[PDB]
Amino acid sequence: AFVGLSDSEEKLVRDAWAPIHGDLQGTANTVFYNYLKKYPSNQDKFETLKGHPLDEVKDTANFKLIAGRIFTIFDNCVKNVGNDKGFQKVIADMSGPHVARPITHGSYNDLRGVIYDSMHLDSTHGAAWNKMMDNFFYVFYECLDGRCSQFS
């Protein structure tokens, strides 16, 4: 389900994300690399990266564009903490390309985990962060399941 955050939790989320907000592309590049390295089956899902060694594509514009667009969405979600309709709309608008493709919940959840590891949060910030990410994926998965109209 979608669960609203408390004032303190909203603050904790913004603070948790702050370091990444301040270097969005640089964090994105490292996280997306660690993701494709630890979970290599996913590289094939990106036609622009498919068929090349990870180390051959990691420094390319294609790779950074993909990494950057993922983190821009999460950045825009954090900006919309406290605005449920705005938060849900950000996700709804990015869900379409994913409805269409052979990508498992495992793949999304593995990405979520690499993101979490890279943030090195204490358990207070982590709990607030996970509430937001649980909300993100509730909306995202509702949209993948063809119930996005409520959010669009």
Ligand code: HEM
């Ligand atoms: C859960 C976090 C992710 C976010 C925030 C996200 C965000 C984005 C955005 C913003 C787009 C482009 C939408 C547009 O063109 O208007 C996109 C496209 C796409 N995404 Fe994601 N994505 C996520 C996860 C994934 C995962 C885990 C994979 C695969 C393993 C994936 C595969 C794709 C592919 C294949 C496309 C179409 C573009 C392409 O051909 O490269 N995404 N995503």
